[PDB]
Amino acid sequence: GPGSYAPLDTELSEIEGLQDDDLAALLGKEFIREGGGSGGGSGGGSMNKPTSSDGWKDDYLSRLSRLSKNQLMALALKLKQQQLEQG
Amino acid sequence: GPGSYAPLDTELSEIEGLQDDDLAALLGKEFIREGGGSGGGSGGGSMNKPTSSDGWKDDYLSRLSRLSKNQLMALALKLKQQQLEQG
């Protein structure tokens, strides 16, 4: 046979490793143009111990929350490009 | 066919219609704490014709570049929830 179907969660681990010099090279024209400004302070609130269900949503949405808008575009393009050549 | 209008009920066209309270109802603890304390839209305009090759990458990246980070997380969660139950 030609090979395995292979892992798909490793694409998040690649986007977590690379930098804005790699992101601008793949987003190109559609790369971000600023406008959000700057600020500070905690905004209040505290952790009351974590909670979870089914596991897949908590692992995935945590990475999506940690990542930049540039990285959110890069992981979305990756998962669309790899799925259309499966099966 | 040379092209199509696409469905009205895609995850992209749904997330572009619903409000920040509907995003908070599915992001939960992972909802953003930034900007005014609740995030917001960014991306700006666009320029020049697209390249002659492909289009499914360019239209998708073009939409995502103008969405809020809350919307980018929610459309990604929706397309993750449906792909893991295929068979």
Automatic annotation (TrEMBL), chains A, B:
Subcellular location: Cytoplasm
Transmembrane segments: none
Function as written in the Swiss-Prot or TrEMBL entry: Involved in production of the polyketide antibiotic thailandamide.
Listed name of the protein: Beta-ketoacyl synthase
Originating organism: Burkholderia ambifaria (strain ATCC BAA-244 / DSM 16087 / CCUG 44356 / LMG 19182 / AMMD)
